[PDB]
Symmetry: D3
Subunit: 245 residues, 6 copies
């Protein structure tokens, strides 16, 4: 009855499976998850260059989603790459996983801490905090200092480091909740929540619920003004498939 | 399966019915709405004095909700009176209708406008914008210059004035969506949305979906630090019933 | 000639005496202090639940003050509970002790540090900083990690911990002054000021001087718009005594 | 018993008399006002160039005040020129009239409007709002479009224009109080307050009360860190008299 | 001696010529301008979708520039698309035209106004203001309500509308300068400046001077942390050419 | 062909030589540097008192510069004393060294750290950050805890301490660049940049390039409104020479 396109903006099939599984586990009855990734792009997103590439992959999948008539979309990278570009292109609502996780966090705690991957992604998270208006609600940001794909490498090392940093954060930061700063951490939310007895929030699941909520409310992206469909233009080269509408 | 206590912070039975009906119309299967109001308080909330009284009524109902074992609560006045006090007292999550409406608005538009009741409530809305961090996302705030209860007076006058102000806002403000600034406007959201072809958002329905989403995510108010249960204290007089736990 | 109602928002007679004594010690000639507390409420204020209860007690006393024809009021809890609600109800000006202490601090130092009671009250102080617009002027906030009433328990332990934290703050924070974050610390201001040779500010005394200043200036709360007397409404139950005017 | 040096930063004897009279009218018993102006400077302050000159004149008088052993100082130009430089040099507290008027305004209204002289002084007022942290509390700023000295020219034209702009502001701005943006408007505060039935605030009188309050509280400028006495240095030329201490 | 790659992020050869000419007219002796545009993309940039496409075109040209050993780059669209992604990829500095125009504006005026193309680009300009930290320095933003390419259509209509809006802005906004909000307006800066006798700033020329200044200062993009070269990754499909280094 | 007056706001001939040499080393062909200092003032600037004195010395030299017909001016103290007053008085543009260094820093790094002289100057730097809008772009501020003139004392001690603090900053702060917080550090920029392999920015050289850029762009200070020439006034005493125009 409700179809939600969950877009992994990176090309890693491994991470697409982690993300898709987290999406399906919290999905309401009647919700179908379509877990996808771009055909062309970058295997993981860890910086501004990666984000700009991922944004175009997101747009490719948004187009696919829209021609399939999906009810909504999630952007399952913590940089929310191409969020506003996607909202212009899409009919249904588009929710980012950083956006969704941060929003939820303000509903269950006064302040939250972020636990992310590499140090260079911290500035990306900071920018989103300021953009979404949640900077005052974030007590601290931490990186585990391992690449994104370390979460899929089978060792459990990155998972253990997330745990240790969550404990440290709750002891030191003066925050009441954790926001996980990576789509690949989606699996850890429920276990850390039960273990640490505080909300540990995965944006993937959170974004699924937001799309479902918006659909049930009969609310979709405003096509009045800023997020109107793109002006009709001739797109050249590899971009020509992006807006057939 | 899921029980959500929807608290009208004012004592108006009329408004409690409007609010309860809006809550039930968007509720997911298996969700039961418990539409309540305080036994003692003010018939409508239009200023700081009214809010302080309403906050204590909210707390009385939160206590009732918690002893009944409800899954979550909504505070159905646009001042979100007693929100943080309620989160301390409650086990399940507590969502305000201004909070919920504003959050949803940022998901479907770049900026929104608020349409509220009396001029003196504008400063209350402004304070919430700054508190929740959405000030940059709000293009403008407008009052229809009629008391809250005018919405229940049967004339359709307040309803018509909301409509006219929504049209005016969308023409002038540079915003893509409307946030309704009163629990009693809940009925108008879906009709104005279809009529004006932009999201017109009722916080009551929005807050119901947030409680449902949080419950499905296994997330509840953090009891670590700021929103921990109140320190155990002897409450005197009319307050002695508030915290039997 | 000038009568100032100093309202301890908690029910502790012990703290009411500390507060009343601090108020009388700095009062100008011709100023009479009326040190009061609510008949029903909470013995100490340490969180959002406590604040919401205290706000209604403040309002009960504001009503008493106004029917007695007092010239002004102070709210002698560092959360300034019910400040705006009180200004609506009162004719004379109403000054909070956090408000007053923070205002004074910006007049004698570039930045100040706050020394308060429990960790969970820090977020309350932070919110007031942002509301009053003094966030940039506050270098740091510290808690002594003892309940409010520890200040009245006779051991001198809380008093010693305030001293130690003040010294630490002045060494580490890059601030030129201390704001005491509790009505019960009122006694310590003058001694710590002389001892540490920097302004250590008690909001109780500071608020008394503000009421006196405003009265001498012929300035009272604006009854135009936001802080106008509450809309005339029927108050039910235990609230019915709040607005007989 | 208490001696307060009220410094008109401009060289106009006419304005010094207006300022001195406003200071004496609200002064507490036992307070002596010393109304002064620099020996060298500018006849009125209307821009950044004027302010920089006025700041040095303020410092010359601060030195005189300090060698006379005054209890405190006011800077009676609405640009508060040389405020922090003065606090370094002075032992007693130094209060600006913009600072004092704005502080008082937040105690009696949610938001205020400013009515000042020339358009080019608006940016000066805006900068002070941001510096003191009151930007959110200021609804609007207006200029009467007449030079500062028009207030002393005997025609009553500038006085009438202040009145008309105050009425306009209260009708249009959504504010509950007026801050007068010129030392020469000091005379109008009490009459406009009675006439318009809202607080109309003169910073001159307000600053006098702040100095009196701080003195009664045993609080003076912090000499720890930022506002410590200037580093001992050889001052050349016309500056050599500024710091004989 | 100094080679500066000026990148038109849109595919319009017409606009590339306007941009290249504006760049060459202010270039210092010894500076060579390389005016380029992407091989694949969108003919004009008017919204978020357009920006995301343009960012990847910018990156394609950055790569070309870097393999040619250019000294620096400018991004000649007023959305500064792909600015941070480009700084990661490039060795020499990368300056956006909105960034450069806004920076210059704060050096010659207290506040500026923006005159841009379509209403839907205003929110893009607003976001950049907040990101670069210039929001307080911008008095107002205006659109001429014509598409970007109207500037190249030969009628002089868009040019006349820019002029009229500049005059209107200087009369109404309380600003001392204009920032042109489109690369295609580059031609108008010098003529409007002479005609209106205020700074009217073209970001294209401004960005050229910044690259020249940074090169002469021996300053280039920091490769420490946030703007380090992208992590070495396998790029698939049409993206595989982006990072051969 | 281009004449730039570089004003050392302090009276130290030693520092004037350091500043003049740094200015000449990056100057474009055809640019003549006029390195000057006031005839009367303070030997070094380390606090608010010093700044107010230095501002008037700056104005004295601005007048000299303008009667000589210079193309622009730099204010070579890191407090940018008298910047706006100077822009009013001058015809050519006036650039501060803090202003210029901070502006450049945002072009080559996401965030920067400041390394300055005495602890009491940190608050001055903080105020400029907020004024120029760069507060979010500054990761941290550090003082070497030595007076300004220690840089000219020949021991190399202050120089070594700058180096050590730069290394520490880059390890700890999460910043990609250093802004030198003193005119006397100008010499160190190029050596530390090469040594630490990140941009280490001297505002003196940076400000020279900005004046050159603005002149080449045909842009000068706006004489419309806020930065118009001062209102024609009779200046008395030692100030009478400041505005003969
Ligand atoms: Cl991610
Ligand atoms: Cl409501
Ligand atoms: Cl308290
Ligand atoms: Cl004035
Ligand atoms: Cl453009
Ligand atoms: Cl310096």
């Amino acid at each position: 009855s409700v179809r939600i396109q969950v877009i992994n903006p990176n090309t890693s099939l491994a991470m697409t499976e982690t993300i898709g599984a987290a999406a399906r586990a919290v999905a309401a009855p009647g919700t179908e998850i379509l877990a996808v990734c771009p055909r062309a792009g970058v295997p993981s997103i860890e910086g501004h260059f990666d984000e700009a590439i991922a944004a175009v992959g997101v747009l490719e999948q948004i187009r696919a989603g829209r021609e399939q008539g999906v009810d909504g979309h999630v952007i399952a990278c913590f940089g929310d790459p191409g969020l506003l570009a996607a909202r212009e292109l899409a009919q249904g609502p588009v929710i980012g996983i950083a956006e969704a996780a941060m929003h939820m966090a303000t509903m269950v705690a006064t302040r939250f801490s972020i636990v992310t991957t590499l140090p260079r992604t911290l500035i990306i998270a900071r920018h989103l905090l300021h953009q979404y208006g949640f900077h005052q609600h974030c007590a601290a940001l931490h990186a585990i200092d391992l690449p994104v794909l370390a979460l899929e490498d089978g060792s459990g090392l990155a998972q253990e480091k997330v745990r240790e940093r969550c404990i440290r954060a709750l002891k030191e930061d003066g925050s009441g909740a954790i926001v996980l700063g990576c789509g690949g951490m989606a699996t850890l939310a429920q276990q850390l929540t039960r273990e640490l007895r505080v909300p540990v929030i995965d944006g993937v699941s959170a974004a699924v619920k937001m799309v479902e909520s918006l659909v049930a409310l009969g609310l979709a992206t405003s096509k009045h003004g800023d997020l109107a469909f793109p002006e009709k233009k001739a797109l050249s080269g590899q971009f020509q498939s992006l807006n057939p509408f």
